[PDB]
Amino acid sequence: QPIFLNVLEAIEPGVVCAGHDNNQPDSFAALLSSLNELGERQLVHVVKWAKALPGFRNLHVDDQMAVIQYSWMGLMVFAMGWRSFTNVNSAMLYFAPDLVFNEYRMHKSRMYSQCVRMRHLSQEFGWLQITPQEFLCMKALLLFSIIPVDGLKNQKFFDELRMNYIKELDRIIASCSRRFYQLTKLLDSVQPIARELHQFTFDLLIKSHMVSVDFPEMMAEIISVQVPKILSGKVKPIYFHT
Numbered sequence: 001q002p003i004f005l006n007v008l009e010a011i012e013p014g015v016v017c018a019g020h021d022n023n024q025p026d027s028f029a030a031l032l033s034s035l036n037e038l039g040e041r042q043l044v045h046v047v048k049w050a051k052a053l054p055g056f057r058n059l060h061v062d063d064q065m066a067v068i069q070y071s072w073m074g075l076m077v078f079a080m081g082w083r084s085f086t087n088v089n090s091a092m093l094y095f096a097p098d099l100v101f102n103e104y105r106m107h108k109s110r111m112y113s114q115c116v117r118m119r120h121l122s123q124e125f126g127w128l129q130i131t132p133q134e135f136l137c138m139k140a141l142l143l144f145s146i147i148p149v150d151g152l153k154n155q156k157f158f159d160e161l162r163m164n165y166i167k168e169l170d171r172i173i174a175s176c177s178r179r180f181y182q183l184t185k186l187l188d189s190v191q192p193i194a195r196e197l198h199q200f201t202f203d204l205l206i207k208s209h210m211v212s213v214d215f216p217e218m219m220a221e222i223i224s225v226q227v228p229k230i231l232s233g234k235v236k237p238i239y240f241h242t
């Protein structure tokens with residue numbers, strides 16, 4: 001319909017596999033190493049997605065990387081939750097076609113609770129009958145949903161961008177307002193999830209030698225330089241609802 005929807009559809013990243021060896025048995029080290037690797041792979045695509053987003057180049061260059069660097073966990077969880085929805089109706093987590101988590105992997109990854117949280121999120125796409133277009137605008141909005149408490153290098157450009165992505169979400173919803181409450185509530189629910197994964201990946205990186213869980217270059221860096229900013233409270237999500 002609009003140029004906006006056109007673009008989100010056009011730029012939506014395709015299939016990313018994890019490289020996981022599905023012949024080897026399930027083990028914390030194998031699974032988490034494959035996850036970390038899927039993380040690196042998807043990071044590459046999120047950067048490119050983000051950069052091709054309407055209005056994105058309005059942001060100051062510093063803010064362009066910051067915003068991505070802070071929001072990846074949520075975008076990735078969110079996108080994954082939708083894959084898990086469309087591909088398997090939320091019965092398992094469809095991280096990638098070569099890394100689908102059944103309950104046994106949920107428990108073997110040592111992230112069962114976090115996993116059940118994501119499965120639930122995935123179910124929400126069903127329970128609310130989220131349209132493919134609702135999904136894409138929502139995921140777009142997620143990128144503008146976490147920021148330093150100090151604001152950004154150029155706070156005004158960000159606010160404008162964030163304002164218009166809200167407007168678009170609203171235009172594509174357009175009592176019809178329970179809809180908006182719900183979706184905004186759905187969006188807020190990504191954040192407590194991402195915070196758990198944040199603490200978890202961080203702890204994991206710290207003891208990563210002691211468990212033989214393997215971290216790739218870009219993952220290690222972001223998790224040690226950027227993720228701690230979030231957990232120390234220097235960077236916080238923007239919630240719709242208090």
Ligand SMILES: C[C@]12CCC(=O)C[C@@H]1CC[C@@H]1[C@@H]2CC[C@]2(C)[C@@H](O)CC[C@@H]12
Binds near residue numbers: 032035
């Ligand atoms: C973002 C990823 C990787 C890609 C994805 O589809 C969503 C998923 C959610 C769990 C993350 C994982 C990357 C590796 C992490 C960060 C692990 O170290 C702990 C939790 C994992």
Ligand SMILES: Nc1cc(N2CCCCC2)nc(N)[n+]1[O-]
Binds near residue numbers: 127128181186
């Ligand atoms: N789909 C939902 C949504 C939902 N709410 C989402 C938004 C408002 C607060 C909780 N609660 C329940 N039980 N289900 O099944």
